[PDB]
Amino acid sequence: RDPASDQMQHWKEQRAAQKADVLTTGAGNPVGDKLNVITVGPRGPLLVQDVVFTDEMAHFDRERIPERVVHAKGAGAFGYFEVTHDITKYSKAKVFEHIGKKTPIAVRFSTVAGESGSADTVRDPRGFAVKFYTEDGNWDLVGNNTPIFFIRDPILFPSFIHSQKRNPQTHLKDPDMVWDFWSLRPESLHQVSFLFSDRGIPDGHRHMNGYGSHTFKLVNANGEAVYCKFHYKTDQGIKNLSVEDAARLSQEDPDYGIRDLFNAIATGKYPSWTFYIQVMTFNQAETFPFNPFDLTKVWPHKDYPLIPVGKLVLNRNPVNYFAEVEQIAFDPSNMPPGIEASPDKMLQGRLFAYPDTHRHRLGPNYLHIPVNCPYRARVANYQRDGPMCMQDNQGGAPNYYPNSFGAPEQQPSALEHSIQYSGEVRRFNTANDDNVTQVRAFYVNVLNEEQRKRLCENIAGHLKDAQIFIQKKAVKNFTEVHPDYGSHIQALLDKYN
Amino acid sequence: RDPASDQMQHWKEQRAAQKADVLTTGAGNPVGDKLNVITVGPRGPLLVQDVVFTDEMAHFDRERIPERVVHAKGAGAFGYFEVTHDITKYSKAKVFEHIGKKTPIAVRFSTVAGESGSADTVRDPRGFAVKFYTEDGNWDLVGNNTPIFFIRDPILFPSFIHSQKRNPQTHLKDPDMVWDFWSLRPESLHQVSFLFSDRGIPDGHRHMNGYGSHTFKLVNANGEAVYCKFHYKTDQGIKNLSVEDAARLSQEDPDYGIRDLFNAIATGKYPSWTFYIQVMTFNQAETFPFNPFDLTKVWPHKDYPLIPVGKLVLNRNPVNYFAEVEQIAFDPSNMPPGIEASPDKMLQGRLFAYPDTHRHRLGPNYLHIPVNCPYRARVANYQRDGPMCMQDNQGGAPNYYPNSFGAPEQQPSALEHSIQYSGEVRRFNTANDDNVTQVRAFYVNVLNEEQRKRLCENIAGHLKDAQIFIQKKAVKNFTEVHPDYGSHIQALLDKYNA
Amino acid sequence: RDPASDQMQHWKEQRAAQKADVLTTGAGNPVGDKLNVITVGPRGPLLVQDVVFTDEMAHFDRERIPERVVHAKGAGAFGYFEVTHDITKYSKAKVFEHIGKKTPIAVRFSTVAGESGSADTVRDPRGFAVKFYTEDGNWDLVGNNTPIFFIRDPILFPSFIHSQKRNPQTHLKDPDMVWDFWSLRPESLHQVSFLFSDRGIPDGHRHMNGYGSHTFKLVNANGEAVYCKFHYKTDQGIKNLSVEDAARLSQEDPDYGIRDLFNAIATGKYPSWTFYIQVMTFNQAETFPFNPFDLTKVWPHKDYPLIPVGKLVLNRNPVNYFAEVEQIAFDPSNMPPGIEASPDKMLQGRLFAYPDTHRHRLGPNYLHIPVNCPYRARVANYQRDGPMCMQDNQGGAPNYYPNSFGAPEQQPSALEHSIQYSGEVRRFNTANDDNVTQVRAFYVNVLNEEQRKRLCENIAGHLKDAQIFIQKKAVKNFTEVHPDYGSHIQALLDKYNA
Amino acid sequence: RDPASDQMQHWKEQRAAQKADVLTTGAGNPVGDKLNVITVGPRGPLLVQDVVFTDEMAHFDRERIPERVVHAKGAGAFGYFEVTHDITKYSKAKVFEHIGKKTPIAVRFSTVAGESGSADTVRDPRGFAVKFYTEDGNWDLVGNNTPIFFIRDPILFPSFIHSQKRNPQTHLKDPDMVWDFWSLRPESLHQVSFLFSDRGIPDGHRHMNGYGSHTFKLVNANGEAVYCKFHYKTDQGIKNLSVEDAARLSQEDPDYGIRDLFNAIATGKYPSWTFYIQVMTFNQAETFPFNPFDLTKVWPHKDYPLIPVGKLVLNRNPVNYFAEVEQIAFDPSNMPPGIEASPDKMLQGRLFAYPDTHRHRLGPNYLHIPVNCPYRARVANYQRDGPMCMQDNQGGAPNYYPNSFGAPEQQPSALEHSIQYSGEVRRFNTANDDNVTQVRAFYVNVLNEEQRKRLCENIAGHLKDAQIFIQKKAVKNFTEVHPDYGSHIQALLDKYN
Numbered sequence A, D: 001r002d003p004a005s006d007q008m009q010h011w012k013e014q015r016a017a018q019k020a021d022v023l024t025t026g027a028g029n030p031v032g033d034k035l036n037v038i039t040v041g042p043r044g045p046l047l048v049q050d051v052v053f054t055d056e057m058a059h060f061d062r063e064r065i066p067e068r069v070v071h072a073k074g075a076g077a078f079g080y081f082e083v084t085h086d087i088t089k090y091s092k093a094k095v096f097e098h099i100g101k102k103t104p105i106a107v108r109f110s111t112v113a114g115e116s117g118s119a120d121t122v123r124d125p126r127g128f129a130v131k132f133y134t135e136d137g138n139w140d141l142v143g144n145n146t147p148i149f150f151i152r153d154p155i156l157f158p159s160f161i162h163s164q165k166r167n168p169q170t171h172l173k174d175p176d177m178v179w180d181f182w183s184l185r186p187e188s189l190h191q192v193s194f195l196f197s198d199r200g201i202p203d204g205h206r207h208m209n210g211y212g213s214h215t216f217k218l219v220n221a222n223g224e225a226v227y228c229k230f231h232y233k234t235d236q237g238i239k240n241l242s243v244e245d246a247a248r249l250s251q252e253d254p255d256y257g258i259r260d261l262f263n264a265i266a267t268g269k270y271p272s273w274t275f276y277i278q279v280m281t282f283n284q285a286e287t288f289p290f291n292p293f294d295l296t297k298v299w300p301h302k303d304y305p306l307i308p309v310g311k312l313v314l315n316r317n318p319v320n321y322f323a324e325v326e327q328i329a330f331d332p333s334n335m336p337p338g339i340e341a342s343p344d345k346m347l348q349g350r351l352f353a354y355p356d357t358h359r360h361r362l363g364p365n366y367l368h369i370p371v372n373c374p375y376r377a378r379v380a381n382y383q384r385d386g387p388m389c390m391q392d393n394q395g396g397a398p399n400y401y402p403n404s405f406g407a408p409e410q411q412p413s414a415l416e417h418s419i420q421y422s423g424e425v426r427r428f429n430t431a432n433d434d435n436v437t438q439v440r441a442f443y444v445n446v447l448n449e450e451q452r453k454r455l456c457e458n459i460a461g462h463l464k465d466a467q468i469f470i471q472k473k474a475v476k477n478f479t480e481v482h483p484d485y486g487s488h489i490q491a492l493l494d495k496y497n
Numbered sequence B, C: 001r002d003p004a005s006d007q008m009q010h011w012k013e014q015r016a017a018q019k020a021d022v023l024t025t026g027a028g029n030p031v032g033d034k035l036n037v038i039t040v041g042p043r044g045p046l047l048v049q050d051v052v053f054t055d056e057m058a059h060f061d062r063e064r065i066p067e068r069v070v071h072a073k074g075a076g077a078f079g080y081f082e083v084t085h086d087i088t089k090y091s092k093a094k095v096f097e098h099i100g101k102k103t104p105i106a107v108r109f110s111t112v113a114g115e116s117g118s119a120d121t122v123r124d125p126r127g128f129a130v131k132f133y134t135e136d137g138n139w140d141l142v143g144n145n146t147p148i149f150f151i152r153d154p155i156l157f158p159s160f161i162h163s164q165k166r167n168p169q170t171h172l173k174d175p176d177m178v179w180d181f182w183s184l185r186p187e188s189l190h191q192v193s194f195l196f197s198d199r200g201i202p203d204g205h206r207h208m209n210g211y212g213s214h215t216f217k218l219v220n221a222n223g224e225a226v227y228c229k230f231h232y233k234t235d236q237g238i239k240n241l242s243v244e245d246a247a248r249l250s251q252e253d254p255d256y257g258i259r260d261l262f263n264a265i266a267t268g269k270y271p272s273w274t275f276y277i278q279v280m281t282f283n284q285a286e287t288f289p290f291n292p293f294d295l296t297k298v299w300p301h302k303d304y305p306l307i308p309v310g311k312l313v314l315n316r317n318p319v320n321y322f323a324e325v326e327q328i329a330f331d332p333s334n335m336p337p338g339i340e341a342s343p344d345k346m347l348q349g350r351l352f353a354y355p356d357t358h359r360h361r362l363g364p365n366y367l368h369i370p371v372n373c374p375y376r377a378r379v380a381n382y383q384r385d386g387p388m389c390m391q392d393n394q395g396g397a398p399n400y401y402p403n404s405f406g407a408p409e410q411q412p413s414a415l416e417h418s419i420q421y422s423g424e425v426r427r428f429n430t431a432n433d434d435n436v437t438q439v440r441a442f443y444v445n446v447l448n449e450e451q452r453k454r455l456c457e458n459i460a461g462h463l464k465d466a467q468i469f470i471q472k473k474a475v476k477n478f479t480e481v482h483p484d485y486g487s488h489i490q491a492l493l494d495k496y497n498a
């Protein structure tokens, strides 16, 4: 059968010659019998001194860790990034230092709202997270399959996640929550139009693009800084699943994406993505018609063309899923010198959110789980102890800074880039920014007639389950985007109602 | 629109008169604005001073707790147990003390292998766990929808659970693991025959029976002990979903059971169960043809009739799912005086397994989560502290026993019943016990022709995905049960393999 | 016998009439016998079904939580704050709203570096943390017994804490670490001079002052803001322990402060503190000779007089130490409307550091441990779940914002005060700020001859154990403060080294 | 200066030639400046963008783990055990398999009741825990400096521990609790007499003996079983501190034992212990005048002589205290084939108590913290996942047993020895066992006049702080042991009162 079906057979075939290992306890003590327990006679009660049973049973009882608060259902793979073009005039990061340089990568794909156990082929944004193991530490590009997101302020993210998830009382998916949140926040129209198009259900993880979706800052060796976007487009082509096909697959094969990626890598059909950047100077960031740090906007390709950088290749399947996929952690704040953060508020909130959730989910010392370790860099600092400190704890080195005993020193060349900001320190309302121009451009100029009609059908078929007043508010926003948009959606809703 | 769809509308309607509450932080400080963050200028970076954002963000980051290692996907409800018949001659537990007395209950239904997010209408055993809030402490009857289980020794339970879950490398369901484990352990044939019949997919949680699968010990006020089984049959009738209907429902409505139970309770259609016991004397346990403490065997009804006890009724929906259903914990060791454990090895392992996993999953002080608290009895002991110690940590009372300062004292009437056992202390092999007699009885006498044909078709349609040698071993076990069983399964496998 | 010695006798005396409680398990099941375990025969092995022993033992195995990373050794008490003067022109916080208003408080005193188990009467700064339970949420004033601290940048705090604690290899106190850090960072001279004076060892917790030590921002109802300091001076008088007396007490009574506070409150001798503020306008902050947000500086009293505000009274002893003292958590970010943070970098770091460490030490839901709960305010937000959720989890209320179903709304009057800042966003060096002027003022004008000579003796007696080059660097800093300071310390060091 | 105080100087001297390391974050990213934070101008507020500060600060905030519920204050060392005599007729354990074989060991010394920060030189029992790294798994001999203990039933251990610690309200040491518990349970008289003698305060950890204190079962290769006791006597000699000297040292040097052990090993003065066993046949365990599995009784030397086995030597100091001493865990259930548990009820309770508390204190995967790992054995079983799994999660091997794919198998030779027991299954009262015979033997025949007088003075000076009726009950128990004992204690109490 398929290589995923033959995992145990393949393992047995590689271990055909050798004799089976001796079964031991967690402390290495050999086990005499692990099929029966110690009782007082044949029909008597169990004994405490059966420590083999207790040792196995307690560890079984402690197997689960909390799942991710979002993107719980996921698939992992490994490979490398290779440089194909020179962009050293924009960035001085070691990952781009010369043409042909290779950096090992780790990649996790995921959905957003479904828990670990839900189906892969549902309408949802897709996570595309890449971990670069560079000599200047780990670089995490925690991206999506869309260049934009629903909201533009990080304080609304927990509310959006709650509204996309189950009702707090009935534990059911509630369209009222979803559509009340979306109609009260019309800045989500762009990503809603993206989500309900054909690209909302990709045909596996190999047939979709990846976007960092934030503005980032590139600094070169001379100290000059530019703003950038990150793109990586699939070399396999964009492929999508129809609504009926996805509905069938969700029942027949709830793990469609995992099986597809594993069977592709196992047969040597390695998927690749071509890595691009967009570049915006500060002067033309001043004159951009929108806010260039707004997560609901893209940079048009005519004014900001793609610049090739390299390519991402995935050629290795995980050996153990729990150790390499479930325990992997991506922190957007993991940036080497040459890559920095832009003043995008969403990115600013993400700078705190991810290590904070990783400490809770995995542990304070999660950075030295082997899949998360920066094994191509040298870690030396004044941090000590913590639960599950699996090292020499940096030995007997001095643990305070500054000192006069030869402990590690700071590197002045790794200093951040300086920007002067104007304005007072307060909360600025961004709910009334431009919400319809790029949505109108997508509706009129990007989609053709059939894609547009399918998008309207999908929106109506999801929105018809909500209350009437939420329907009117959503239709009002859609009519603000385009009158035909709202009118078609309202006609389909009238048919449903 | 069903009442489940109108949850927010109903909540808004009960609060029509009142003005909305003031939005505060976790420390109660009122919040000025929670739609925008604090930046230096309109297009500047974020400030640490925005403690409102950090306070909400970290709590959102800490929302998830580890799911149950088994029975992760579940549905909760609440109600009461009522006594309708007198069994005081068998047990002295306060829950059965007189006819007509009521005890509040909490119930969780669940599947077994699927995690959170998996579908409800799949072929699986169903959990039926009942928590009695009794004045003599909490009593947990952690039952299933089948009277039997796959294995009879508790040390094989982690291996069986692993074999029914995802492959450790590919993270996929692996028929090889499932059927290799089942063919290497032929004592699972009885529960496999149960599982692949029509009752493997119940039509919601209201149309299925509940069984305390282990044998238990009942002690009366005179110190006499008997062995017992627990049954509670649905008053709604047994109803099952066909394979095609369940397949359609799994993708159309993955939360079919939760919605069904909630909409039943919300409309006033309260599901009910009739509570029964089987009773075996110790002489009858000596003369029983099998081991009476074997989890792969039942007590036949013609020799051990059902004795009515009471009624289980569920009439209240959960108010908050996470606090009442996700955080509820059932410990089989929670037994009041009058109810004890039998020497069933599975039950003995479960006596340790559940509080240990509860301490891991919820916390050391999980017993004082409000849904888990024994609020109808009085807690007084010499246990102190631990993480999240609420109330007053039993005040300044003496924390050592014995003492001379009026601290709580042991109650001699609550002493366990004493039994003399014979034999050596070692591991006794039970893999070669009788594995086919009751399976043959179920195959020949219980099922009719159509149910038998569907059972064979289901078994073949699952086993076809396994390797050839595992197929032959499983067919050998089925032929050991009955020649026609194995012959039909092999013929269907031959059709599938070509 | 003191009342602390008679705790158990008193508890027995209040329970003279009533009969002792029944000893139960954690689930409320009555215990037959808790002095012997279940064995097969008198000389046989232990049984799993002895669940009483397992429950008690497993709970005993989990009663330790991690201690505080600093201020581990501490003492707690409770009382109230009362307003005696009108400061409504400066702040609109409800805690100061009218004269005579009372607010319940909780107070923890502590040392800094010693772990839970170390002695009380050692040379160290003392923590003085006050938690106000106001109707606008909880307000925590996490203060010290000194108005200043050793460093002025929050990124050096873990290094300073490590240097004051045990060596990473030998696990011993290492004067090399302490004095190398202090000599490499000359900004610590002011707080070092404070620490090695007579007030470095107070005579219990009732004979010492308390300082917020940070500049804070007070905003009134009209939107005008001022900068403020917080003071609360002991009404019992400043009293200190000599070096020899403290050394004797450390081994004779390692819990001197706890016993002193408990016996004071138990006999009705309630300690009191008078609450003051200093007020700086923004123009005065512009014209201040130093940085007014520097943690190594004080505001001189002749230019910024004390303004009386209120009264802190402690009159209730803790009932259970672990529940009310070990589990209490103070967050400087807990500020009601009318009180805000200043741009002091140390305060900015603390704003993140304290809830972050509370989530790890106590749990994500630590704010609803009863001693930490804002029980005089109404908590309503969109935060849900988390481990050990011990309420209705806010029921079935909508959990997203904004919504259209009557869920809690933001309060616009609780918005923060707005300030425009100038300059680039980068790291600014503050190591070369003024380090010796206020230290010289303290050395020359505050201390008399005997206090000065004792201070020099204490400094030399601690610094003698360090290496020679660190001794020269420290002596160089002391000579920078004053030539006689450094010369006296060097002469005493010369005597010690020979 | 002692070598302990020159730790940083020594580290700097071994790192004199090399250049200092570059200071990085936990993810390996080089740090530009770690002395100042990022603010909005010289006097502005702090930025979230300062991820270096947050990364260091959160880890500092997560440094502490819960201390041990008992024996919190401790000192660690490392070395080896060597076989000097042949006892293979009693045991088939690989650790004793031939003369001259070495096995690496890890040792922790500790007090009992004091927490971290408390003084070393106080009157208390001393823990002497030895971890053998054996090719048949790890063997932990969790011993004490006394052959006996206060109680004989494991269900009273939490009550005794609570009574020896702080009052639940005042958080102070309460003599009422201690002496009420001791007078209500007169089986503690033997260990109380031991504790209040001169050996209650050892002169460091090198001048004291070690005892397993339990009866254990030794099984040879032919299946024959015997009962045994474990002894290891100090080759440095028994040395004790006087009450006044210990009181002075507690104030002056609260870490006297740690410094003494470290400076002994650092200067090459390696402490050693001689390893002995007592042997009781199953026939003569029936005719023993007491219960041979009673923790309040010893086996007399004239009837059960010591049999030499080997030497315990400590020659290596810890490199990092937290990783090697604070995180080390000893499980009495860690026993290789050839060593088993006896029906001692205290040992049976300890079989459950220690792994249960280790899972809470350190983590579910505490057995693979490097100091706890059985690195000289091969670990292979069907346990998977759990928090903080750091090696491979045993790869893609089959995780269920039995299987048909070559996974590890049980070893029938490692089966336990089987014993038939008689009697009912219930709770048997052991409070009325013999409580005074061996105490009387110790009082009359072991101690001389001066030691006896000092013991009486110490007991009186501790008991005078308790209430009067507790004093009478304790005096009644002491008079039961010997009339002169109780009369002297009562006269001293009368002087105090």
Ligand code: HEM
Pocket (backbone or CB within 6 Å): C061, D067, D068, D069, D070, D071, D074, D108, D109, D110, D126, D127, D128, D129, D142, D143, D144, D149, D153, D154, D155, D157, D211, D212, D213, D214, D328, D329, D330, D346, D347, D349, D350, D353, D354, D357, D358, D361
């Ligand atoms: C029923 C009786 C006992 C129980 C339940 C018990 C329980 C415990 C527990 C929970 C710990 C904490 C371990 C850790 O957190 O690392 C501990 C430590 C310890 N116990 Fe016991 N104990 C008992 C009696 C004894 C006896 C009889 C001995 C010696 C003969 C002993 C010697 C020790 C030692 C040396 C340690 C420190 C181990 C280390 O250095 O990590 N205990 N005990």
